[PDB]
Design a protein around this ligand. Sequence first.
Ligand SMILES: Nc1ncnc2c1ncn2[C@@H]1O[C@H](COP(=O)(O)OP(=O)(O)O)[C@@H](O)[C@H]1O
Ligand SMILES: Nc1ncnc2c1ncn2[C@@H]1O[C@H](COP(=O)(O)OP(=O)(O)O)[C@@H](O)[C@H]1O
Ligand code: SF4
Ligand SMILES: [Ca+2]
Ligand SMILES: [Mg+2]
Ligand SMILES: [Mg+2]
Lengths: 280, 279
Amino acid sequence: VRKIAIYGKGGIGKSTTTQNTVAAMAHFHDKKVFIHGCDPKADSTRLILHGKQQVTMMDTLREKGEDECTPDKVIEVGFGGVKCVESGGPEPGVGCAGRGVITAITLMEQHGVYEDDLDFVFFDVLGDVVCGGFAMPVRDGKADEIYVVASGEMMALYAANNICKGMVKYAEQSGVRLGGIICNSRNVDGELDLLQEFCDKIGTQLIHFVPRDNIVQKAEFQKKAVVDYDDTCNQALEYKELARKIIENENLVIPTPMTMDELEELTSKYGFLDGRAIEG
Amino acid sequence: VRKIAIYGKGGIGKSTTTQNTVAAMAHFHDKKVFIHGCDPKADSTRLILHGKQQVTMMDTLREKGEDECTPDKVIEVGFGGVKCVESGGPEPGVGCAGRGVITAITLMEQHGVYEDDLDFVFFDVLGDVVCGGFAMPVRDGKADEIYVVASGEMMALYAANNICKGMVKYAEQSGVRLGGIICNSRNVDGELDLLQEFCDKIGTQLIHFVPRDNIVQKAEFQKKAVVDYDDTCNQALEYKELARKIIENENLVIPTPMTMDELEELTSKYGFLDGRAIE
Ligand SMILES: Nc1ncnc2c1ncn2[C@@H]1O[C@H](COP(=O)(O)OP(=O)(O)O)[C@@H](O)[C@H]1O
Ligand SMILES: Nc1ncnc2c1ncn2[C@@H]1O[C@H](COP(=O)(O)OP(=O)(O)O)[C@@H](O)[C@H]1O
Ligand code: SF4
Ligand SMILES: [Ca+2]
Ligand SMILES: [Mg+2]
Ligand SMILES: [Mg+2]
């Protein structure tokens, strides 16, 4: 099995790219896949599950008890046979936001879930901080490969660069490698060129350019991933290609992060003095 | 002294709104202010300090020691007499990202820094997670008032809503209150009306609408806050008014958070279907 962690800044498109890429792997490429939601937002599986807000592993632990919390009570199966779990976690301020991820991965590992007839496991992880459970995929070797969803936004590059920093520190001991950056387009001029340049500075590849397509919201309104909603539309075929590239990917590196000054220079070069990158 | 925490998602404009609002408080309203950077990005004060890259207290503690990590070595004064400090944080994956914030605020409190001839203390706080040091102004009573910078972005409203959740759990005991939402414009039609209704839903006020103005980047190139760069331009006057509104504010509430589905319903109502607010 190949264990893949997906990182990126909040709102960048982690759950959209993960669910649709996973949907494509199952529907187009005949893969058996597992999504482990590792973001407190806890909607990383709702489209695969056609709207169902999955009971989190932390909520099951709370309500059912340590003596009764088993993987079968937290795994749900949805589109394409994709198995889903949501880690959950403490409410805001109650405790470590990433505590639920730690408890959830541990239980999954104890029972061999990731090893049970799967080609791929995808972790959909919060990347605005790299600590606690959110750093497990990089630091403790819980994932083999990492892909980062990014855009021309400064904070998107910042988030990607911080995961690279975590990798410089732990990857030689943990075995995790960087498979590349995914440009999730916001339809802003220069985003592709910027991220291609970013990838070259840190020593990775820009694996795919996912276009902006409001079919994503059309399918969301029907509680479906794009590949589920219409498997012949352009966006579904874009995810079919992104899935093929991941499946076929052999480019796996330990990156060389950039400095903050280098990051400012790169965004200024492409007209994003306003880090929010609203216009190219 | 009034201790104010500024929350919001990364890139929303917390450090810009804070530095320019604080610069307006000191320059236009003769207020003595302290800025405490509580974001690991650690550039919350460079405009007040005219580009100076501050040494973080956690870096100082590491190189000098606790007996020597005194506020005199970490506090710096810049435009309008504003005192500045950066908490710092561990490197990615090394430890709790908010640990520096706990140690920093603790040291500043034990030395009476916030009580030393100050009208306002502003904490510029990372809000994408609400835990560790980042939760101290909500849970532990280290702030009196909160303002969230937001926009039409779904995750901006989500971040604001998570602060509300933290307040429902702790604000009665901690004494913190919500002073309002600040809308940092993304120049997207309907943003103001969306945030207005959002404020109405949770029981607060949309205290001010800060326009998007590229004079901000012009002043940044000069290493200055807008008010410092040009105190007569329209954006400087916008921060003058936001500063006035905060000084005079008495609408301080404990809000009612919305559920995830209510938030999706609300953004869809106003045409913000793609939650990235770009168009
Ligand atoms: N390629 C795309 N085209 C159109 N909309 C997108 C695309 N990718 C993401 N989105 C939208 O952007 C918003 C953020 O996506 P999401 O997956 O929830 O981000 P994250 O999981 O990183 O927080 C959602 O409203 C989603 O519909
Ligand atoms: N009112 C505004 N007009 C123009 N640009 C702005 C405005 N507010 C923020 N910005 C820009 O947006 C980017 C993010 O601002 P920043 O304060 O760093 O956000 P945060 O501190 O929340 O991460 C910066 O490049 C800044 O220049
Ligand atoms: S380790 Fe990270 S997620 Fe946990 S309390 Fe600290 S900042 Fe929050
Ligand atoms: Ca108080
Ligand atoms: Mg998500
Ligand atoms: Mg900031």
